[PDB]
Design a protein around this ligand. Structure first.
Ligand SMILES: *[C@@H]1O[C@H](CO[C@H]2O[C@@H](C)[C@@H](O)[C@@H](O)[C@@H]2O)[C@@H](O[C@@H]2O[C@H](CO)[C@@H](O)[C@H](O)[C@H]2NC(C)=O)[C@H](O)[C@H]1NC(C)=O
Ligand SMILES: *[C@@H]1O[C@H](CO[C@H]2O[C@@H](C)[C@@H](O)[C@@H](O)[C@@H]2O)[C@@H](O[C@@H]2O[C@H](CO)[C@@H](O)[C@H](O)[C@H]2NC(C)=O)[C@H](O)[C@H]1NC(C)=O
Ligand SMILES: *[C@@H]1O[C@H](CO[C@H]2O[C@@H](C)[C@@H](O)[C@@H](O)[C@@H]2O)[C@@H](O[C@@H]2O[C@H](CO)[C@@H](O)[C@H](O)[C@H]2NC(C)=O)[C@H](O)[C@H]1NC(C)=O
Ligand SMILES: *[C@H]1O[C@H](CO[C@H]2O[C@@H](C)[C@@H](O)[C@@H](O)[C@@H]2O)[C@@H](O[C@@H]2O[C@H](CO)[C@@H](O)[C@H](O)[C@H]2NC(C)=O)[C@H](O)[C@H]1NC(C)=O
Ligand SMILES: *[C@H]1O[C@H](CO[C@H]2O[C@@H](C)[C@@H](O)[C@@H](O)[C@@H]2O)[C@@H](O[C@@H]2O[C@H](CO)[C@@H](O)[C@H](O)[C@H]2NC(C)=O)[C@H](O)[C@H]1NC(C)=O
Ligand SMILES: *[C@H]1O[C@H](CO[C@H]2O[C@@H](C)[C@@H](O)[C@@H](O)[C@@H]2O)[C@@H](O[C@@H]2O[C@H](CO)[C@@H](O)[C@H](O)[C@H]2NC(C)=O)[C@H](O)[C@H]1NC(C)=O
Ligand code: NAG
Ligand code: NAG
Ligand code: NAG
Ligand code: NAG
Ligand code: NAG
Ligand code: NAG
Ligand code: NAG
Ligand code: NAG
Ligand code: NAG
Ligand code: NAG
Ligand code: NAG
Ligand code: NAG
Ligand code: VR
Ligand code: VR
Ligand code: VR
Ligand code: BR
Ligand code: BR
Ligand code: BR
Ligand code: CA
Ligand code: CA
Ligand code: CA
Ligand code: CA
Ligand code: CA
Ligand code: CA
Ligand code: CA
Ligand code: CA
Ligand code: CA
Ligand code: CL
Ligand code: CL
Ligand code: CL
Ligand code: NA
Ligand code: NA
Ligand code: NA
Ligand code: NA
Lengths: 527, 527, 527
């Protein structure tokens, strides 16, 4: 029976057998006041204190959110849907510790993605027990509010200031500063990691001055805040908040009154109207996301990055070979998970209109021109592959490389990876390749479980990535030093070396997507 | 009558005449609770306090240990056997101070070797009175537990966590931080030095975070923790602890119960079974040594070294010209201290089987191939000399040079020496050359005593080494500045300069054993 | 009426008219217990405290010392003799402050020379009122004990530990740390300056750890501790202390008893026997000087210099063109202040025997050989000039340049000058040229007084040196920035630039005395 005294009271954990050893898991520890009633849309308030033993022995409620119903019964989509009850009462976190209790263990804090609209820390692919067993690190993950409930903004107004879910993440970081030594963690050795919006979130903590002292370093998987979906303009945030009001019958003249009305709405009515606050979305829409609130974020983040205003520390950044494919089967015409999706030029053109709705005709033609010069055989898959690369390059890969360059120019070591292994268990079809989100299970060490039907080469790839991540967190250097592995060189401006992660042979390469990213980075923003 | 007030109470010392001056010696000051009864196999507990004057006027008990009985009556082996009573009650230390009492003297702390199975601070060759007289430094040495009593490991279990004898060393370092100013020492200028396992120990204090603030710099004579005998794997430690239990009739199912049984055993029964916890040892076996315990040592030390996780400070590292010869007369066939040991190819082959018992046939042939390409006359001593070089290069010289390279790559000054003077008094035969352990008497300044029958050239070599060591401890630079001596260059990656120590002429050389160490360092670990 | 509250009590100063303004002078403030009776030969004890106003309106007693009687009535020698009463009761200091009282003025602390046997702070040429008037700095000077009373050593014994007069200097430095803000000084901007033994003293404060925090930077005029007269060996100090005892009838067996006997002697008997503690002196003899005491000086100072163990700060160092001439008329045969001293080869040879009494015949011939290769006309003054250069190069110029090189090699800015102006008022004859001690009046700004009959070019040279010294003290850079002056380059190893100080034109030159100093520095020490 394992009980830990925290600043707010006692917590009971549970023991787990993992690989012939034990991990102690504390699932569902609260770290804030439930944000209900008058607290809805406000910054998380600090926890009152309890007396008695809080039983942290099951995952807590996931935050309210819309759910992906495009492929019911299909594991490829459903694995990402929440696996605990939805409730506004969702501000909880999990702690996995090695057994016996470590003395001063490095801490890995996971921030999930989901577009800032969805996600929960209790998914199977985020289970931190394998990392605690194998690397003897402590792993922490928190639920944070998503959608309008997490990111509604009327900026400057403390009834709905914006970025509440980023403040939920920050308050969990603070909980780890105050409490983790009780669990055997070193509050001075904390690495944030996250994927997609969780990676964009990690990048914004590098920018936020109230996060500077809450962590040591950062890992960004397929996301960074300069991605075109990651930050909402003040203009679009106000418009969306008042669009939400209009839809829920909460248009008022005093803005504090709009929010008060919005506080009387059933959470379902808020969720049901979120999709419509925008005149046309895309599969990549982030209707309620981070804004420049003057609090968490003091200025436009592109300006902070460019002018070197961020935490000086090491970063590890990477992307997957086919980031954009997952999004094509949520509305691009001629695409389907259930066939090979050989599409025509006309379909490609229609697909750009689906992904680039506010963009001028010239803008869309410039994309077509950059991506359709083949290269050369015709090649029925030409247009199918180009559309996935358009979406992946624009939304994930070029912003990650641009973030990595600008960050490294200010003197800190940066390491960049390109993940190019397709999981042998992937339920999505082959044409979708190495999809967005499908390195995560390798990072959390799921293929280390021999009972799970991953191949032996995958068990080895995962073990090595697990070691590199842990070495990054502990030592700021993502090497695998014992097995004659390829040395991972720092990513510098000028050379731009990156490491490929694959089952066959790790390679050092240079200037990932050089020609494509010149297009998105220097020309497209003008269009 | 010289009495010093310490944090734990008064201690009376004794005066010594040395070279027409006086040294005050405090021999046998306790620095921990005797580790008996319930304390056996546990970390040293801090000292209770006394009232009265503790008489520190004789060497204390040496720790329990097996003794070298291979050459009874022979000074060459017997000089290393303990010269005070053996007892579990052995956690004491010695302090030598200049007279008159210095004002803020640099402190040299000696850690003896003995394979982590043997050794004591009271040997004649470790007498710190000459260094206190001649260099006006304070010299400190401690007894620390050895064998299973010092290093039994069931890792994670505080009844027998491992590394207890390294914790004994650390607690003595703390005693010097708290007490040495009372004796006229500067706790801010402390250099650890040690030979063989004492040098491996010094290198592990560079890695241990609880030692970082207990000393300023380090000297490593013939040892470092990356030597193949210096650190036991978790796997081999558990196996050896349960092998010990089996042999003593202490196999139990609850592991805390194994230890409790082991605590009821006579110390003799533990000692008698130590040799057998392994299926085949060698003359170089370290059955109970340092382990990765998650406490003293947070990770595999090769990983810490490679990734720069150690105290940033200057080091002085060296080895003797014939490190491996001493071990050949403890079991290699055809060797003898009492003849010239001209051995055959067949004997050489048998000798590899004695020194490399777990190694594949191909592994052993690769050693034979690397070492038997002569060079060229035949040369009856060819195989005898090659076997000594195999053992010395693998076990001492290549790991020391590898440690020195990896340490210096992180920016700190490193100085490397190659000791090539054979003591005119050496009781071992000539063929054994400049043996392991036989620089020690030069370092402690025994040849400064003209009454002792060392030659005049040896008195001069010792005086100069004594000055270089003292300058290293005081100033981080092992120069002899007054007598037109050869300047000792820092050892850098790339050039790898070292200094030769000999009676004739000091030389600056480069890339000691380059061809041999490429073999042991890059190829042999794969075999 | 100007009264300042110090930590030890009130002091009344006096006003002075200087150049149509006012300076306030506090002359004779005590800074230690009078070192009489039981305190004779001991470290200065701290001052008790007074209540009442201590009148600091006249120079205090100079310390006991022998006096220069070689040229009675002659201003050239007599200007250096003490101009206040001699007494053991002599531990006082002077403060000159600008009027009105500055707010946070840089402090210049003068340490006089006199071979450590003689000197006093009240000489006319050390009057700090001109510097306080013109540069608005505060100037401080102290009397410190000289001769056996200041430097008798039985080392390790606190009844006569050695270096007492250096401890007197240090305790005055402490007085300035504690008190000078009351006078309007900045304790954080203090530059020591001194000439001859006062410069050697300044250099030893750079080495002494108890002086490190008592000052910011240093100026060395014609002296540094590596000069062959500046530091006494332990061997020669013991011999001289027991020689003193023998001469005064104080030979005893208990050494604490020797000192007690020496404490009953009239100060005159100690002074009368000082000259004889050595079997043969020279005009340059320092019978009782600094020793390595293990307290003020922790090791041989050549070792500290070479190995970089000193305060890291800027230095200003210089020498005069004819340092050695002053000494020739105190005993070299054929020399006289009252004729042109054209000497023969035989006389030169005799003169070397006078200046190098313990030196082998070969040593003396090597000097003759290095200095008598002309160059070429014969030139009756050949031997006269060579003997002055032998004495000046060996004793002053080469050690200063060697000190400056070794100091600058550790990273600090160093500025070196060569003073080559002969005072128009010099009472010594022309052949003696730019003598030792005759920059001092230029440094203290005596030629700024138009009433004094210095030339106009001298008034300008002094004004410029006064400004460079003050800029050095305030800003660490001895430039004269307003009058199109020659820029003073840092002295680096390799180039060795120095600045010439003269009435005509300042020049940047390189490698002062290169050929001569190679002789004294690398060869002569072997002889
Ligand atoms: C791959 O399938 C798509 C997607 O839509 C289809 O899913 C199929 C597996 C099948 O069940 C089909 O009946 C279903 O509608 C096909 O595109 C669709 O085809 C029709 C015309 O035949 C269009 O009018 C539809 O609008 C279009 N749907 C979308 C969303 O674009 C696609 O042609 C097929 N590709 C193949 C077989 O290569
Ligand atoms: C050097 O001596 C060895 C060691 O063993 C021997 O010690 C000798 C000094 C002598 O007392 C001898 O009787 C004693 O056994 C010799 O090797 C040994 O020789 C025999 C055969 O003659 C072998 O069967 C032994 O096993 C072997 N012992 C070991 C430990 O190997 C060795 O030959 C000798 N070398 C010489 C003289 O050059
Ligand atoms: C310069 O004078 C010296 C120094 O000694 C002398 O001082 C003179 C000015 C004069 O009063 C003289 O009588 C007095 O002794 C002369 O050297 C001295 O000369 C004599 C021989 O004539 C030697 O035997 C002395 O020992 C010697 N004295 C010393 C101290 O060396 C010197 O010759 C003279 N030089 C000239 C005039 O060029
Ligand atoms: C933000 O403001 C208006 C609001 O229009 C919206 O009304 C909402 C409550 C919601 O239901 C939403 O779907 C609807 O679009 C946006 O105006 C739209 O623009 C179109 C033309 O593009 C006009 O027809 C309408 O005013 C409105 N659309 C529809 C379909 O009725 C406006 O575009 C937006 N501002 C932005 C995006 O910057
Ligand atoms: C660790 O575990 C076993 C234990 O075997 C040992 O039993 C001990 C109590 C002790 O007396 C020791 O000498 C004995 O070896 C090791 O198994 C050995 O391996 C051999 C074959 O190599 C087998 O015959 C036995 O199981 C045993 N040896 C003997 C001679 O009986 C095992 O090798 C070891 N694990 C390691 C080294 O990783
Ligand atoms: C230090 O010790 C002796 C002491 O000799 C001295 O006696 C003193 C009290 C004093 O009066 C002094 O003038 C006298 O020299 C030194 O011995 C001298 O050396 C000479 C030969 O050089 C011998 O004749 C005597 O022992 C003595 N001199 C005289 C003239 O009587 C000794 O040289 C010295 N040690 C050193 C310098 O290292
Ligand atoms: C916590 O769990 C234990 C079950 O072992 C139980 O004794 C205790 O009552 C629980 N607390 C609850 C249910 O609030
Ligand atoms: C943990 O390590 C840090 C340095 O990262 C240290 O300051 C701290 O005190 C350690 N705490 C322990 C061992 O409890
Ligand atoms: C609007 O109403 C709120 C809450 O009822 C009140 O506190 C606020 O001052 C009002 N402001 C304006 C501008 O009407
Ligand atoms: C290194 O290699 C071993 C054995 O060859 C393997 O089992 C282990 O997984 C590897 N470790 C890492 C961190 O990749
Ligand atoms: C310590 O030694 C002295 C001997 O000079 C003695 O007076 C005292 O009793 C001793 N203490 C012991 C034996 O415990
Ligand atoms: C000893 O030296 C240190 C610096 O190494 C200094 O900080 C300390 O106070 C000194 N103590 C003394 C002289 O007692
Ligand atoms: C084993 O016994 C010990 C001591 O008697 C006890 O404290 C411990 O909890 C037990 N553990 C197990 C796993 O049996
Ligand atoms: C230096 O040389 C001297 C005298 O020539 C000698 O006696 C002494 O031992 C030497 N010192 C050192 C430190 O080697
Ligand atoms: C100090 O000087 C003044 C003279 O103006 C006087 O009043 C006072 O008595 C003096 N103190 C003495 C002489 O101790
Ligand atoms: C004098 O200047 C120093 C910096 O050199 C500053 O720290 C100090 O407080 C100042 N004091 C004054 C103006 O009284
Ligand atoms: C010598 O006498 C002194 C003072 O009278 C005394 O304190 C000291 O202990 C004695 N020492 C020796 C060695 O005779
Ligand atoms: C600079 O020049 C002026 C006027 O030409 C002169 O009077 C003054 O002495 C000079 N100042 C210095 C610091 O040399
Ligand atoms: P990630 C799956 O959180 O990506 C955000 C999406 C909206 C581009
Ligand atoms: P050192 C004599 O302590 O060496 C260890 C041995 C076991 C290799
Ligand atoms: P300065 C005049 O103090 O020189 C010392 C002399 C003894 C060389
Ligand atoms: Br077209
Ligand atoms: Br063979
Ligand atoms: Br001659
Ligand atoms: Ca690709
Ligand atoms: Ca996803
Ligand atoms: Ca690899
Ligand atoms: Ca050799
Ligand atoms: Ca040994
Ligand atoms: Ca030499
Ligand atoms: Ca000249
Ligand atoms: Ca003078
Ligand atoms: Ca000029
Ligand atoms: Cl390239
Ligand atoms: Cl080379
Ligand atoms: Cl030049
Ligand atoms: Na086409
Ligand atoms: Na052969
Ligand atoms: Na001549
Ligand atoms: Na010569």
């Amino acid at each position: 029976d394992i009980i830990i005294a925290t600043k707010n009271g006692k917590v009971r954990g549970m023991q787990l057998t993992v690989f012939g050893g034990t991990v102690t898991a504390f699932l569902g520890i609260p770290y804030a006041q439930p944000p209900l009633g008058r607290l809805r849309f406000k910054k998380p308030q600090s926890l009152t204190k309890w007396s008695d033993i809080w039983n942290a022995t099951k995952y807590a409620n996931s935050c309210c959110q819309n759910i992906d119903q495009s492929f019911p019964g299909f594991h490829g989509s459903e694995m990402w849907n929440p696996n605990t009850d939805l409730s506004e009462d969702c501000l909880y976190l999990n702690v996995w510790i090695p057994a016996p209790k470590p003395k001063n263990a490095t801490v890995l804090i996971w921030i999930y993605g989901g577009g800032f609209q969805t996600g929960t820390s209790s998914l199977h692919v985020y289970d931190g027990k394998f990392l605690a067993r194998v690397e003897r690190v402590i792993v922490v993950s928190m639920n944070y509010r998503v959608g309008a409930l997490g990111f509604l903004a009327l900026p400057g107004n403390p009834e709905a200031p914006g970025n509440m879910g980023l403040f939920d993440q920050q308050l969990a970081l603070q909980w780890v500063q105050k409490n983790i030594a009780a669990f055997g963690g070193n509050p001075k050795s904390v690495t944030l990691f996250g994927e997609s919006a969780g990676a964009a979130s990690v990048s914004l903590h590098l920018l936020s001055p109230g996060s500077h002292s809450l962590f040591t370093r950062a890992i960004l998987q397929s996301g960074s805040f300069n991605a075109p979906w990651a930050v909402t303009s003040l203009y679009e945030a106000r418009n969306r908040t008042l669009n939400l009001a209009k839809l829920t019958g909460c248009s008022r003249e005093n803005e504090t009154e709009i929010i008060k009305c919005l506080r009387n709405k059933d959470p379902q009515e808020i969720l049901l109207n979120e999709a419509f606050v925008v005149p046309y979305g895309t599969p990549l829409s982030v209707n309620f996301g981070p804004t420049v609130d003057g609090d968490f974020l003091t200025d436009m983040p592109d300006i902070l990055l460019e002018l070197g205003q961020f935490k000086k520390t090491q970063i590890l950044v990477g992307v997957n070979k086919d980031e954009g494919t997952a999004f094509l089967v949520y509305g691009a015409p001629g695409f389907s998970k259930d066939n090979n999706s050989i599409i025509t030029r006309k379909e490609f053109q229609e697909g750009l209109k689906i992904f680039f709705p506010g963009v001028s005709e010239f803008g869309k033609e410039s994309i077509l021109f950059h991506y359709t010069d083949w290269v050369d055989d015709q090649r029925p898959e030409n247009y199918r592959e180009a559309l996935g690369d358009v979406v992946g390059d624009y939304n994930f890969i070029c912003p990650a490389l641009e973030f990595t360059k600008k960050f490294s120019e200010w003197g800190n070591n940066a390491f960049f990876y390109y993940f190019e292994h397709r999981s042998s268990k992937l339920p999505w079809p082959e044409w979708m390749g190495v999809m967005h989100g499908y390195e995560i299970e390798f990072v959390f060490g799921l293929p280390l479980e021999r009972r799970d039907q991953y191949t032996k080469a995958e068990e080895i790839l995962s073990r090595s990535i697990v070691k590199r991540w842990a070495n990054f967190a502990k030592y700021g250097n993502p090497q695998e030093t014992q097995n004659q592995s390829t040395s991972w060189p720092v990513f510098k401006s000028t050379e731009q070396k990156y490491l490929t992660l694959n089952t066959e042979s790790t390679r050092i390469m240079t200037k990932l997507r050089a020609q494509q990213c010149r297009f998105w980075t220097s020309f497209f923003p003008k269009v």
